[PDB]
């Protein structure tokens, strides 16, 4: 939110822990909400 | 026969890691999509959530 | 030659005290009064002539010429390569 | 035989892994650019060299000379030259526009952009320019440009290089560039560096993106900076000078030693004077010359130190000449050690440096400037602000090179003397083996407006009725 | 290439500059760098000398203007342009 | 004549960050700064680390306080050397002093 | 209106222009410069003269141009690469070398 | 300030390269800022009407700011190292017709129209006083 | 008519970082985040802190869960406010609640 | 880059007081 | 009806925090001044201080 990227597809992020241990981490953030307007449009059946 | 520097190894491994994370994002997106338009009762569950 | 010049210039002085390293450092060089091995870094002030005791000494190695004929030898070899390559030595070098 | 094994072994273990230039460069392409940037931004000599490139390759100005092929196009000379004058006037009034909106960044002019491109191609190996259409139609010309750092062209999603996709460059089977991948800025380095694919050549005939570099072998997709041949040497030079300076600091800072058996405080009070009446130790005043007394056992000996420049200057001389040879710039230009120099020798060195600079100018700055000019000319002719001759055998899109044929005028070769060179120039023009346009271009102007201003001068002089100049009757 | 890869005999194996834009590489301590330069020029003779040379040679004592309007672009006469 | 040996104060000895916290205190005497503490058996107040109750050390005082101080501020983390921190005379063994804070975010070098 | 010309100038030190409250730097906001998506400078957050450094310094926003096109503020420098906002001082390449030189003079 | 062991040719080369750098930096910094300040004052003058516009202007100043406000600048010129040789070069240039008074007075830090007008005045007053015509008459 | 206050939820009381970790869970019933936790004296499982046993409190639950959650995620580092934490009703002494998290990277303010 | 710390710490402590010319002069002006 | 981005919301709350911080520091020196020139002797004492 510091750079105003509140709405975005993906978000790679990079940083390294401080102090005596110095180790780098790679991050990815997202929040998908795959949706569809009308469920009745599709018909799902299980064959047997 | 042709060694590489540790920093070159760093760039290789980080590129591989970001590719893997992108693949994981694609996996979860596809899973949500198939659950959604396969039942419409699409759960969203998991530990630490 | 670059490496040798680097090391010979870098090692400038040395201490011959019987005591421990940090005691030698803070009684011949100074520093100390730290904020928090790596021994201790001495700030670059001015002069600060030290005092010594028997059995202790400070020796500043004089090193030697960094270019003891290296330039002229390289110039000769540059004449050699220029002749081999067929271009003028002055233009090449 | 010489390359086989080596006399008495020698290079028995060295055998470079022969592969293409791309295979040699691409694996560490980003690291090489980063190292070059570090050197140029933290080294005085690198900055001096890039400044020399900037001032010599293009100089402080750049004048266009558009000479369309009237004979090739079946176009009469009169209308050809009239059209040339029109387009030259339009380009000159548009390029130096105080709007600074030749680039959407709005911080550079035409010459500044050319210099930016020259500099980044010098210390990276290539240059990238994008031409865009500003939506705003307030300006007569809605075409702008953007410089792109070479690091901004990279493979999207950090994908590995393929046969056709090499470092964010999609090329055909023949190896010609087809598409590029670019990323937005990454500052601060915390948000995604997304990717955008841009075709190099728009199908309309316009060039959306232009990537200019000097290749060294076939299939080379990215240029390599000249620094690659001097990286380690110049870094070692910087380290050596720095550590030598530090060592000299230490050796000079330690000057005297005092040894005694009693307490250090009392010894310093009784030897160095000190201010005991007032670990702070005991700082002493600096008054007149003083002589102490010492009993046996104590001794105060000054240190002879050591010569702080025992050949380091000569070593710097040799290293700087090597760096200058690697860079292609003259040693005196790079180091400003203009000592022990004669007129003929300085003239020859400046001459060879100037020849190299002119070659680089023609191969980089002239080409990119011509490309930008033709890109602008396409929009100009489309908006019909200028008109081609009606008898044009070929259309502009058919004969872009013919219509947009142009050369450039940069900063002239400033002579060491000037007197001899200008006597030579006037003797040339009187002997007739040269011409006014040639010599004026060499000096840094154009004979056309030179003659126009001569007419203006003589008209003003005859109006004032004082004296006609040395061109009349 | 070969020199930029790792260096002769290892040598510059620890020299791995980060590749960023100069904005990312300078803005963090941009104020600190400006402070260093300012103090240096204020309290060094050589830096002050260089600045004085810049000041006295970049412009000099005087600075005259010559207005040359684009009369050809404006379609206006030369005499009117000169009077303006 | 009048000379002094000046050195800076070094609360730390390494790059491990030190963090602080505030808890109600029940000190009965003037406790100087950088003094170990422990919990009360019954009232669960804070008292100076006696040096005898083994394994009950909790933290190290940051700012010297007194009886009137309802609450005290103490470092909940960090590293300290042997000599910078004063110790109760009841704790007389070097090993006990060294390892009294074992198992907590407080470390002794 | 005592003068025929209403235009007056005032220099602005680089320290006088910076991010208000020394906050972070976003995409459009970098070191007190508000730019568009393409990077064209739009506005400036200039800090008032905080001398002496006691009264709280306040930032004021100023457009690069007026709606009529008048350039109320002018920023001039030599960029080194695309997407660069603040110029680099010429001394930046030799700072520590010259500083050590001065120390050598003194010692 | 260490001018030791310097010969004429090397001094000329160093001075020429330094002056080229200085002129480039002048054009790329001082010219830009001066042009911006000048146009900002020029628009104020034009709206204050103290100056007069051409009647048949094809385009107005608002859209032709660069066209109307185009200008160059001249600071202190390249000061001579010898002087005699420089003026010899200038006079032989003007004789050969390869140069113009505008740019020669520019490199000397002067104005061609101003010097012409001053010469006109000096010739007029010399004729009036009957002392001697200068080297520009009839 | 109806008045509703918009308040910021800020459990942390200090800049000290808060870290999370997972451990086997034996929750008796529903338990929301910010809940004191303890180890079963026998089964070594994680359960809700009783509020009476001294020193039993170990960590602070990070996410609401129930008995079905075999594994629980909880905070081990950081500082939190007295009101921001929901404590078991067994705890009734303010000093006891304040000093319950003594000796660990979890602190109260 | 070089403005940060220098070679091997080097100017690890040099932090000049960025301030106005008045702040530089007036406190020690007399 | 006119809802803004959470980024601008964060900017707004940061400005509010800055203003509150400034008022809080200002009132401290105000109390210092009133204590000083109302009784001369002036003691400062805070928790964890």
Q: What is the least distance, in Å, from the CA of G23 to any CA of chain K?
A: 9
Q: Is G59 helix (H, G, I), strand (E, B) or coil?
A: strand
Cα(D451)–Cα(H99) distance, rounded to whole angstroms?
Answer: 9
> In chain F, what is the straight-line distance between the N-terminal and C-terminal CA atoms, in Å?
36
Please list, residue by residue across D362-375, b when 16 or more beta carbons sit within 10 angstroms of its beta carbon and e when fewer do: eebbbebbbbbbbb
Q: Looking at the DSSP assignment, which residues form a beta bridge with residue D180?
A: D169, D198
Closest to D409 in 3D by CA, of D210, D208, D114: D114
**Closest residue, chain F, to I15 (C-alpha):** F19
- Cross-chain Cβ contact D339/H6 below 8 Å: yes
Write out the two tokens for I60.
């602070």
Residue with tokens 């306080």: F65
How big is the CA angle at D118 (ends D115 and D120), to the nearest 5 degrees?
105
Cβ separation of G40 and D245 shorter than 8 Å? no
Question: Could you say which DSSP state residue H97 is in?
Answer: T
* Opening angle at CA K9, ends K8 and K13, nearest 5: 115
d(CA E5, CA D232): 10
In 10 A of CB D411, how many CB atoms?
20
What residues pair up with D210 in beta bridges, in sequence order?
A: D129
Cα–Cα distance between C77 and C85 in angstroms, integer?
12
CA nearest to D399, candidates D88, D117, D74 = D74
Q: Cis link prior to D30 (omega < 30° from 0)?
A: no
Strand order in the sheet with C51-52: C51-52, D256-259, D299-302
* Neighbouring C-beta atoms of residue A10, cutoff 10 Å: 13
H/E run at residue F22: strand F20-24
- Tokens 């702080």, located at residue: D308
Pairwise CB contact (< 8 Å): G56 & K22: yes
The whole-angstrom separation of Cα G76 and Cα G65 is: 14
- Number of C:J CB contacts under 8 A? 3
Rounded Cα–Cα distance for residues D443 and D454 (Å): 17
The CA distance from D92 to E68, in Å, is: 13
Q: DSSP letter at G15?
A: G
Beta carbons of D23 and D16 less than 8 angstroms apart? no
Give H-chain residues touching G8 at CB under 8 angstroms: none
Nearby residues of A48 by Cβ (< 8 Å), 6 or more positions away: none
Q: What does the block give as tokens for H101? A: 């008074």
- If we measure between CA atoms, which residue out of D147, D148, D143 comes closest to residue D94? D143
Of the candidates D43, D244, D234, the residue with the CA atom closest to the CA atom of residue G95? D43
Between CA B18 and CA D414 the distance in angstroms is 55
Q: Both tokens of residue G103?
A: 């120390």
In chain H, which ranges are continuous DSSP H helix? Answer: 8-25, 31-48, 65-69, 84-96, 101-107, 112-129
- The three-state DSSP-derived secondary structure of chain D is CCCCCCCCCCCCCCCCCCCCHHHHHHHHHHHHHHHHHHHHHHCHHHHHHHHHHHHHHCCCCCEEEECCCHHHHCCCHHHHHHHHHHHHHHHHHHHCCCCCCCECCCCCCHHHHHHHHHHHHHHHCEEEEEEEECCCCCCCCCEEEEEECHHHECCHHHCCCCCCEECCEEECCCCCEEEEEEECCCCCCCCCCCEEEEECCCCCCCCCEEEEECCCCCCCCCCCCHHHHCHHHHHHHHHHHHHHHHHHHHHHHCCEEEECCCCHHHHHHHHCCCCCCCCCCCCCCCCCCCCCCCCCCCEEEECCCCCCCCCHHHHHHHHHHHHHHHHCCCHHHHHCCCCCCCHHHHHHHHHHHHHHHHHHHHHHHHHHHHHHHHHHHHHHHHCCCCCCCCCCCCCCCCCHHHHCCEEEECCCCCCCCCHHHHHHHHHHHHHCCCCHHHHHHHHCCCHHHHHHHHHHHHHHHHHHCCCCCCCCC
Name, in order, each residue with C-beta under 8 angstroms of F60's C-beta and a sequence gap of 6 or more: F34, F35, F36, F37, F74, F75, F80, F85, F101, F106
Q: How many CB atoms lie within 10 A of CB E48?
A: 13
Q: Do D93 and E2 touch (CB under 8 A)?
A: no
From D408, D427, D67, select the one nearest H98 (Cα to Cα).
Answer: D427
CA distance A22 to chain D (A): 18
Structure tokens at D404: 């947009």
- Cβ G65 vs Cβ G72: under 8 Å: yes
Instruction: Give the Å distances, CA to CA, from D25 to D210, F11, H41.
Output: 21, 50, 53
Asked if F108 contacts F98 with a C-beta cutoff of 8 angstroms, the reply is: yes
Q: At a CB cut-off of 8 Å and minimum separation 6, what does H17 contact?
A: D55, D333
Burial of A25 (0-12, 13-18, 19+ CB in 10 A): exposed
Distance of alpha carbon D64 from alpha carbon D409, whole angstroms: 7
Q: H/E/C letters for each residue in chain E?
A: CCCCCCCCCCCCCCCCCCCCCHHHHHHHHHHHHHHHHHHHHHCCHHHHHHHHHHHHHHCCCCCEEEECCCHHHHCCCHHHHHHC
Q: Return the C-alpha torsion angle E77, E78, E82, E84, nearest 10.
A: 10
**D16-24 long-range contacts, Cβ below 8 Å, gap at least 24?**
D16/E2, D17/B2, D20/D217, D20/D219, D20/D220, D21/D215, D21/D216, D21/D217, D21/D219, D21/D220, D21/D224, D22/D166, D22/D219, D22/D220, D22/D221, D22/D222, D24/E1, D24/E2
Tokens 């001096």, residue? D48
Neighbour-count burial of D18, counting CB atoms closer than 10 A to its CB (0-12 exposed, 13-18 middle, 19+ buried)? exposed
User: In which element (H, E) is residue F59 found?
Assistant: strand F57-61
With contacts defined as CB-CB under 8 Å, which chain E residues touch G31?
Answer: 27, 30
Nearest to G81 by CA among E30, D215, D122: D122
Alpha-carbon distance of G63 to G49, in angstroms, equals 19
Distance of CA H34 to the CA centre of its chain: 15
Residue numbers in K near A4 (CB within 8 A): 5, 7-8
Inter-chain touch C70–D233, beta carbons under 8 Å? no
Give the three-state DSSP class for H37.
helix
Reading the block at residue D287, the tokens are: 């008054």
Rounded-to-integer distance, Cα I24 and Cα B8, Å: 40
Report chain J residues whose CB lies below 8 A from the CB of D242: 7
Cβ neighbours for F42, distance < 8 A, ≥ 6 positions apart: none
Q: Are G43 and G62 in contact (CB under 8 A)?
A: yes
Q: Helix (H, G, I), strand (E, B), or coil: what is residue G92?
A: helix
Cβ under 8 Å to D: G residues 43-72 = none
G9 shares contact with chain H (CB less than 8 Å):
yes
Contact G44, G32 (CB under 8 A): yes
For residues D439 and D428, the answer to whether their CB atoms sit within 8 Å is yes
Asked if residues D26 and D161 have their Cβ atoms less than 8 Å apart, the reply is yes
Q: Which residue of D has its CA nearest to C9?
A: D244
CB proximity under 8 Å: B 1-49 to D: 2, 7-8, 11, 14-15, 18-19, 22
Provide the token pair at F32.
């100087």
Chain I adjacent subunits, 3+ CB pairs under 8 A: B, F
Do the Cβ atoms of D46 and D245 come closer than 8 Å? no
The Cα–Cα gap between H39 and H62 comes to 11
Minimal-distance CA residue of chain D relative to C31? D279
Task: Return the exposure string of G24-38: e unless at least 16 CB atoms fall within 10 Å of the residue's CB, then b.
Answer: ebbbebbbbbbbeee
DSSP state of I56: -
> Quick one: which of G103, E35, D305, D243 has its CA closest to C43?
G103
| D96 neighbors D64 (Cβ within 8 angstroms) | no
- Provide CB contacts within 8 A for D97, sequence distance 6+: D109, H66
Chains H and G touch (3+ CB pairs under 8 A): yes
Beta bridge partners of A24: A16
I1 burial type by CB count under 10 A (0-12 exposed, 13-18 middle, 19+ buried): exposed
Q: Which superfamily does CATH assign the domain made up of F20-108 to?
A: Head decoration protein D (2.40.300.10)
For residue G39, report the phi and psi dihedrals to the nearest 5 degrees.
105, 0
Q: What is the DSSP letter of H30?
A: I
Q: Which residues of F57-82 are buried (b: 16+ CB within 10 A; e: fewer)?
A: bbbbbbeebeeebeebbbbbbbbbee
Please answer yes or no on whether D41 and J7 come within 8 Å at the CB atom.
Answer: no
Contacts with F97 (C-beta within 8 Å, 6 or more apart), sequence order: F82, F87, F91, F108
For residue H35 the two structure tokens come to: 């042009």
The size of chain D, in residues, is: 473
Rounded Cα distance, E51 and G11, in Å: 18
Nearest in space to D384 (alpha carbons), one of D95, D87, D47: D87
Q: What share of chain J is helix, strand, coil (3-state, %, to 5)?
A: 35, 0, 65
Tokens 């002094």 belong to F4
Q: Quick count: other Cβ atoms within 10 Å of Cβ F32?
A: 10
Minimum-distance CB partner of E69 among H38, H56, H70: H70
* Backbone angles phi and psi of H29, in degrees to 5: -125, -60
Tokens coding D353: 């440096």
- What is the stated resolution of the deposited model, in angstroms? 4.1
Token code pair at residue F43:
């009232």
Backbone angles phi, psi at D157, to 5 degrees: 60, 20
Gaps (C–N > 2.5 Å) in chain H: which residues precede them? none
């Amino acid at each position: 939110q510091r750079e105003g990227i509140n709405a975005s597809a993906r978000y790679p992020k990079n940083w390294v822990t401080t102090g005596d241990p110095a180790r780098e981490f790679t991050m990815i953030q997202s929040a998908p909400l795959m949706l569809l307007a009308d469920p009745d449009e599709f018909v799902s059946v299980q064959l047997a | 026969q042709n060694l590489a520097d540790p920093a070159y190894r760093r760039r290789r491994i980080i590129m591989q890691n970001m590719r893997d994370e992108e693949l994981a994002i694609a996996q979860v997106e596809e899973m949500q999509a198939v659950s959604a338009v396969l039942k419409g009762k699409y759960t969203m569950t998991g530990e630490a959530f | 030659q670059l490496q040798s010049a680097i090391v010979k210039a870098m090692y400038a002085a040395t201490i011959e005290s019987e005591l421990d390293t940090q005691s030698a450092m803070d009684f011949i060089l100074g520093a100390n009064s730290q904020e928090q091995y790596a021994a201790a870094p001495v700030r670059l002030g001015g002069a600060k002539v030290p005092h010594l005791m028997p059995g202790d000494s400070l020796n500043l190695q004089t090193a030697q010429d960094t270019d003891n004929g290296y330039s002229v030898f390289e110039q000769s070899l540059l004449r050699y390569i220029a002749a081999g390559l067929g271009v003028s030595y002055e233009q090449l070098s | 035989h010489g390359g086989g094994s080596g006399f008495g072994g020698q290079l028995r273990s060295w055998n470079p892994p022969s592969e293409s230039v791309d295979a040699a460069l691409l694996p560490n392409f980003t690291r090489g650019n980063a190292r070059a940037d570090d050197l140029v931004r933290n080294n005085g000599y690198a900055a001096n060299a890039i400044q020399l490139h900037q001032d010599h390759i293009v100089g402080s100005f750049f004048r266009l000379s558009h000479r369309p092929s009237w004979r090739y196009l079946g176009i009469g000379e009169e209308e050809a030259r009239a059209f040339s004058r029109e387009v030259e006037a339009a380009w000159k009034e548009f390029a130096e526009d105080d709007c600074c909106c030749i680039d959407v960044e709005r911080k550079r002019t035409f010459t500044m952009m050319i210099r930016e491109g020259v500099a980044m191609h010098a210390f990276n190996g290539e240059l990238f320019v994008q031409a865009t259409w500003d939506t705003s139609s307030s300006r007569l010309f809605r075409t702008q440009f953007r410089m792109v750092s070479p690091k901004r062209i990279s493979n999207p999603n950090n994908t590995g290089d393929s046969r056709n996709c090499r470092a964010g460059v999609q090329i055909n089977d023949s190896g010609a560039a087809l598409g590029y991948y670019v990323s937005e800025d990454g500052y601060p380095g915390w948000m995604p560096q997304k990717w955008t694919w841009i075709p190099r050549e728009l199908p309309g005939g316009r060039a959306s993106f232009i990537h200019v570099f000097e290749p060294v072998e076939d299939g080379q997709t990215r240029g390599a900076n000249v620094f690659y041949s001097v990286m380690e040497q110049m870094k070692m030079l910087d380290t050596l000078q720095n550590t030598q300076l530090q060592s000299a600091i230490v050796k000079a800072m330690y000057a005297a030693t005092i040894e005694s058996e009693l307490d250090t405080q009392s010894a310093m009070d009784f030897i160095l004077g000190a201010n005991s009446q007032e670990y702070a130790a005991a700082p002493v005043r600096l008054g007149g010359a003083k002589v102490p007394h010492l009993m046996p056992g104590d001794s105060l000996n000054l240190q002879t130190a050591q010569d702080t420049d025992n050949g380091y200057s000569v070593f710097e001389q040799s290293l700087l000449r090597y760096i200058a040879a690697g860079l292609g710039v003259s040693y005196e230009q790079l180091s400003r050690n203009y000592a022990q120099m004669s007129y003929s020798t300085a003239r020859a060195s400046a001459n060879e440096s100037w020849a190299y600079f002119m070659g680089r100018r023609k191969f980089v700055a002239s080409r990119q400037a011509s490309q930008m000019f033709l890109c602008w000319l396409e929009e100009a002719i489309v908006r019909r602000v200028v008109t081609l001759p009606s008898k044009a055998r070929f259309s502009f899109q058919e004969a872009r090179s013919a219509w947009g044929n142009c050369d450039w005028i940069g900063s002239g070769r400033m002579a060491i003397d000037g007197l001899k060179e200008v006597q030579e120039a006037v003797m040339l023009i009187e002997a007739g083996l040269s011409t006014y346009e040639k010599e004026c271009a060499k000096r840094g102007d154009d004979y056309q407006e030179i003659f126009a201003q001569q007419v203006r001068e003589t008209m003003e002089r005859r109006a004032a009725g004082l004296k006609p100049p040395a061109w009349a009757a | 290439y070969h020199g930029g890869g790792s260096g002769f005999g290892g040598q510059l194996r620890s020299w791995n500059p980060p590749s960023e834009s100069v904005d990312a590489a300078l803005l963090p301590n941009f104020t600190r760098g400006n402070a260093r330069a300012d103090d240096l020029v204020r309290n060094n003779g050589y830096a002050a000398n260089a600045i004085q040379l810049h000041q006295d040679h970049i412009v000099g004592s005087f600075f005259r203007l010559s207005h040359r309007p684009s009369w050809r672009y404006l379609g206006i006469g030369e005499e009117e342009a000169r009077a303006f | 004549t009048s000379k002094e040996t000046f050195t800076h104060y070094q609360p730390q000895g390494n790059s491990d960050p030190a963090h602080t916290a505030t808890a109600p205190g029940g000190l009965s005497a003037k406790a100087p700064a950088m003094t170990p503490l422990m919990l009360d058996t019954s009232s669960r107040k804070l008292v100076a680390w006696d040096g005898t109750t083994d394994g009950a050390a909790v933290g190290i005082l940051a700012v010297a306080a007194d009886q009137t101080s309802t609450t005290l501020t103490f470092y909940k983390s960090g590293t300290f050397r042997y000599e910078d921190v004063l110790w109760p005379e009841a704790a007389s063994d070097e090993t006990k002093k060294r390892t009294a804070f074992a198992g907590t975010a407080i470390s002794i070098v």
